[PDB]
Amino acid sequence: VVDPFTRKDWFDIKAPTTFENRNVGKTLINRSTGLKNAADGLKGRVFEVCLADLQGSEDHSYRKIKL
Amino acid sequence: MSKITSSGVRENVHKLLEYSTETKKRNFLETVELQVGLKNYDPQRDKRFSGTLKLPQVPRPNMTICIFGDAFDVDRAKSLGVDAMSVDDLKKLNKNKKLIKKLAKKYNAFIASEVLIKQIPRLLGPTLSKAGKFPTPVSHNDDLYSKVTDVKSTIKFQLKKVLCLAVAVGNVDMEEDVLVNQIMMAANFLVSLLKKNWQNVGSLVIKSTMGPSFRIY
RNA sequence: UGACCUCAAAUCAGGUAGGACUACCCGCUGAACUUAAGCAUAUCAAUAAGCGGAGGAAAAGAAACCAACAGGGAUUGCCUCA
RNA sequence: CCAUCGACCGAUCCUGAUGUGUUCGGAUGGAUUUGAGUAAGAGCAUAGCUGUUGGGACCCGAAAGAUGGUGAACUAUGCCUG
RNA sequence: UGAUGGUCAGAAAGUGAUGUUGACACAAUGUGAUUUCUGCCCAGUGCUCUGAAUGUCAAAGUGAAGAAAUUCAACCAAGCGC
RNA sequence: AAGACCCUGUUGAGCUUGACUCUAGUUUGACAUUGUGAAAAGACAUGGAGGGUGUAGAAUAAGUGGGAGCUUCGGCGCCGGUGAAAUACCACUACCUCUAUAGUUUUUUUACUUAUUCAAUGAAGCGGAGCUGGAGGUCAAACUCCACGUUCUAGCAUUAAGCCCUCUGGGCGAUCCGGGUUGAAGACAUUGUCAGGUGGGGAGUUUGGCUGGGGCGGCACAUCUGUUAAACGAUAACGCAGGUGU
RNA sequence: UACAAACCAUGAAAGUGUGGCCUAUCGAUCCUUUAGUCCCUCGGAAUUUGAGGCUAGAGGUGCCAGAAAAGUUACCACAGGG
Ligand SMILES: [Mg+2]
Ligand SMILES: [Mg+2]
Ligand SMILES: [Mg+2]
Ligand SMILES: [Mg+2]
Ligand SMILES: [Mg+2]
Ligand SMILES: [Mg+2]
Ligand SMILES: [Mg+2]
Ligand SMILES: [Mg+2]
Ligand SMILES: [Mg+2]
Ligand SMILES: [Mg+2]
Ligand SMILES: [Mg+2]
Ligand SMILES: [Mg+2]
Ligand SMILES: [Mg+2]
Ligand SMILES: [Mg+2]
Ligand SMILES: [Mg+2]
Ligand SMILES: [Mg+2]
Ligand SMILES: [Mg+2]
Ligand SMILES: [Mg+2]
Ligand SMILES: [Mg+2]
Ligand SMILES: [Mg+2]
Ligand SMILES: [Mg+2]
Ligand SMILES: [Mg+2]
Ligand SMILES: [Mg+2]
Ligand SMILES: [Mg+2]
Ligand SMILES: [Mg+2]
Ligand SMILES: [Mg+2]
Ligand SMILES: [Mg+2]
Ligand SMILES: [Mg+2]
Ligand SMILES: [Mg+2]
Ligand SMILES: [Mg+2]
Ligand SMILES: [Mg+2]
Ligand SMILES: [Mg+2]
Ligand SMILES: [Mg+2]
Ligand SMILES: [Mg+2]
Ligand SMILES: [Mg+2]
Ligand SMILES: [Mg+2]
Ligand SMILES: [Mg+2]
Ligand SMILES: [Mg+2]
Ligand SMILES: [Mg+2]
Ligand SMILES: [Mg+2]
Ligand SMILES: [Mg+2]
Ligand SMILES: [Mg+2]
Ligand SMILES: [Mg+2]
Ligand SMILES: [Mg+2]
Ligand SMILES: [Mg+2]
Ligand SMILES: [Mg+2]
Ligand SMILES: [Mg+2]
Ligand SMILES: [Mg+2]
Ligand SMILES: [Mg+2]
Ligand SMILES: [Mg+2]
Ligand SMILES: [Mg+2]
Ligand SMILES: [Mg+2]
Ligand SMILES: [Mg+2]
Ligand SMILES: [Mg+2]
Ligand SMILES: [Mg+2]
Ligand SMILES: [Mg+2]
Ligand SMILES: [Mg+2]
Ligand SMILES: [Mg+2]
Ligand SMILES: [Mg+2]
Ligand SMILES: [Mg+2]
Ligand SMILES: [Mg+2]
Ligand SMILES: [Mg+2]
Ligand SMILES: [Mg+2]
Ligand SMILES: [Mg+2]
Ligand SMILES: [Mg+2]
Ligand SMILES: [Mg+2]
Ligand SMILES: [Mg+2]
Ligand SMILES: [Mg+2]
Ligand SMILES: [Mg+2]
Ligand SMILES: [Mg+2]
Ligand SMILES: [Mg+2]
Ligand SMILES: [Mg+2]
Ligand SMILES: [Mg+2]
Ligand SMILES: [Mg+2]
Ligand SMILES: [Mg+2]
Ligand SMILES: [Mg+2]
Ligand SMILES: [Mg+2]
Ligand SMILES: [Mg+2]
Ligand SMILES: [Mg+2]
């Protein structure tokens, strides 16, 4: 009826410098409007990414990091 | 309530006579062009209106005229009367867009005689006439020079499709109060032509080929 | 160190109010019996009872009146309107 | 004075002249209609008996309703002190 | 019923009872020591609970027409309905 | 002892209840009490300035009433040709827009405190800032945070000691400033007036007749046919057999 | 029910037809609504709305000459009645 995906804005996720491959990926959220900013409703999100991805090496395949 | 302010228009034609006798100008007299504002109406939606009565004194002091035809015409406007015509293009023309377009854009008023009943909706029609021409009711046993000198006094007041219609006439030769109320003897049509009559007024401006606006209604 | 404004105190100086009467008078408040052959609007009634306040009278009173006439001319009362 | 048939005035209905602010006017002639009328006034006033209505209403009589006041010396219950 | 409270009082109040109180309390009911138990029914009448969408829906307010009085229409709280 | 049972009365009262009609209270809405900001979606109004066609005029009209270099100049020039409407125009009006001034204006959110509301105290220490330490690790230079005299004991603590200046007195001791006593709450409650709901807690009243007592039944209560009805007509019973509100 | 004055239907006509072959099959005041006359009034004078009048229907009273109306009293009262 409305296709709610027309109002989504994409953001990039950056990991801390302790890891090597700091470009974790992308997320989305409802686009920032007058009533609600996208920023405040976006902080506090938790991403679970494999440690092997954050370092390239497969030796960390059995650990997964919450960011 | 009727926004008639004759005493207000007395001091305003003086302020018109300021920039037409005092203040600064070329030297002399010109075209009085006092305006209005006009609100509370609607250019579309409703209908149309018109009203012609010959004003007290002489408006157009240099009225432009072009008398049509030669049949019962001209022979009444020779010698003491100027203008007239010599048909000529009434048999040619009729295929040129101009000449008739030139006649309309040059002179300011024609006539209607008793034979022009043909030419107005035949030789012109969609070519002219209906574009904004008003034939003058003139015949034989009539007032002659009196009713065509009052043609200078014959003002209009028709409706188009714009909320302006702030036209005026006259000249500055008038005495200290020959206008003022002569203009008020022209507001009668503009009153009784609008829907709510004396209500559809948005502003009023005193002005000519000379002034701006001196705080009026 | 003195004005002003507002607010206080005194057994300050001098005054004033209260309470009473009931017949009449100026207001507030306010029933029901009754009548309607029942009864609720109505009626009794803008009355009884209750409260406040005067006087020889009180109140009202010199038009933000009546009129619709050929016009009257503060208030009050009687007769009439009815 | 009685019975009956008529006439006049008002209301209602019908007709609708000269005329005219062309919508007013309403002459004239009618109608099993209608009025507490006219048709040579009869009333006003005082008094009396009788009858009527409102009033306490021929006299006496409720169970009820309302308003304003007086009681916990009996007694019910709490408290205080014995 | 956790005090901006429950239950109750007063015509009102800058007014009161519980209250020198605070859920082992105050207030409102039913049954009626102990023993052993208190089954099925929420359709009705109550009581109670939510209202994201929602039929009904007052005054005020809104919009339109009208010269106005006014009329019509939309919206529409609680409640009812669900 | 003017039956207390029974009936009648257009006589009551106590009590009950979705009988009729109301009502205290309460609840819900609106208006007033009622003020100050910010933001959102937006609408307006006012000040600006600026903007435009499909052809044709190469020339971007969007409007309708008119002459003449005005501004040194003369860039472009002022009706005559190209358009339905004319190339400095002007004198101003009228529209409209899409930019800006920080103007009033509805619905939603959250900020303020002075109205209002709650409470306490013998209105005692409030707000802000500053001295001192404890820290952050200082990477300029002292920014941030914390604290700033009392904890084995059923004692005691009251009407300043001490120091500085000399001024039978002033300052420190006892840091400065603001005189908002201190909290809560806040333009919402509350309160006033109407409006809708709820309201046996309470108020007022009513709750036919006939009738072989009354009640229940029935309707003989408005009525029609035949008979009772006794040969005009009339004639009763909760008499007989039946009917009507279509 | 029989006519009077209209306007009609039917029938060749005379005639008949003013609801149902006859004897039952129904409804005041106040209020509202519709029709009619397009007539009178809104009272300082007018216009247009609005309102009020006059005449005829309808909305209904079945307790049918026409109140707006639930119970209980073994707590009971009064006026009476053989
Ligand atoms: Mg003294
Ligand atoms: Mg006294
Ligand atoms: Mg009273
Ligand atoms: Mg009496
Ligand atoms: Mg009575
Ligand atoms: Mg009686
Ligand atoms: Mg009674
Ligand atoms: Mg009264
Ligand atoms: Mg008295
Ligand atoms: Mg007195
Ligand atoms: Mg005295
Ligand atoms: Mg005297
Ligand atoms: Mg005087
Ligand atoms: Mg007088
Ligand atoms: Mg007098
Ligand atoms: Mg009399
Ligand atoms: Mg004639
Ligand atoms: Mg005639
Ligand atoms: Mg005539
Ligand atoms: Mg006449
Ligand atoms: Mg008579
Ligand atoms: Mg006589
Ligand atoms: Mg007596
Ligand atoms: Mg008597
Ligand atoms: Mg008497
Ligand atoms: Mg007595
Ligand atoms: Mg009573
Ligand atoms: Mg005692
Ligand atoms: Mg007792
Ligand atoms: Mg004792
Ligand atoms: Mg409480
Ligand atoms: Mg108070
Ligand atoms: Mg408690
Ligand atoms: Mg129980
Ligand atoms: Mg118990
Ligand atoms: Mg037992
Ligand atoms: Mg048991
Ligand atoms: Mg059980
Ligand atoms: Mg089962
Ligand atoms: Mg159930
Ligand atoms: Mg249930
Ligand atoms: Mg409403
Ligand atoms: Mg309303
Ligand atoms: Mg409105
Ligand atoms: Mg809505
Ligand atoms: Mg609702
Ligand atoms: Mg509900
Ligand atoms: Mg007796
Ligand atoms: Mg007795
Ligand atoms: Mg008994
Ligand atoms: Mg009786
Ligand atoms: Mg009673
Ligand atoms: Mg009773
Ligand atoms: Mg009793
Ligand atoms: Mg408010
Ligand atoms: Mg304090
Ligand atoms: Mg606060
Ligand atoms: Mg408020
Ligand atoms: Mg209120
Ligand atoms: Mg109510
Ligand atoms: Mg209420
Ligand atoms: Mg109740
Ligand atoms: Mg009762
Ligand atoms: Mg009986
Ligand atoms: Mg009965
Ligand atoms: Mg019965
Ligand atoms: Mg019976
Ligand atoms: Mg009867
Ligand atoms: Mg017989
Ligand atoms: Mg017989
Ligand atoms: Mg006939
Ligand atoms: Mg009049
Ligand atoms: Mg009737
Ligand atoms: Mg009737
Ligand atoms: Mg009866
Ligand atoms: Mg009854
Ligand atoms: Mg018993
Ligand atoms: Mg019994
Ligand atoms: Mg006997």
UniProtKB/TrEMBL annotation, chain A:
Q: Where in the cell is it found?
A: Cytoplasm
Stretches of the chain forming a coiled coil according to its record: none
Q: Which family does it belong to?
A: Belongs to the eukaryotic ribosomal protein eS1 family.
Subunit structure, per the record?
Component of the small ribosomal subunit. Mature ribosomes consist of a small (40S) and a large (60S) subunit. The 40S subunit contains about 33 different proteins and 1 molecule of RNA (18S). The 60S subunit contains about 49 different proteins and 3 molecules of RNA (25S, 5.8S and 5S).
Query: Could you tell me what this protein is called?
Result: Small ribosomal subunit protein eS1
Q: Which residues of the full protein are shown?
A: 20 to 86 of 256
TrEMBL record, chain B:
Naming one, the record's GO cellular component terms include: large ribosomal subunit
The domain of life is Eukaryota
Q: Name one process (GO BP) from the record.
A: translation
Q: Which Pfam families match?
A: Ribosomal_L1
Alphabetical UniProt keywords: Ribonucleoprotein, Ribosomal protein
GO MF term list: RNA binding; structural constituent of ribosome
Which PROSITE patterns does this entry report, sorted A to Z? RIBOSOMAL_L1 (PS01199)
The record's SUPFAM superfamilies line, in alphabetical order, gives: Ribosomal protein L1
Record-stated family: Belongs to the universal ribosomal protein uL1 family.
* Protein name per UniProt: Ribosomal protein
Name of encoding gene: RPL1B
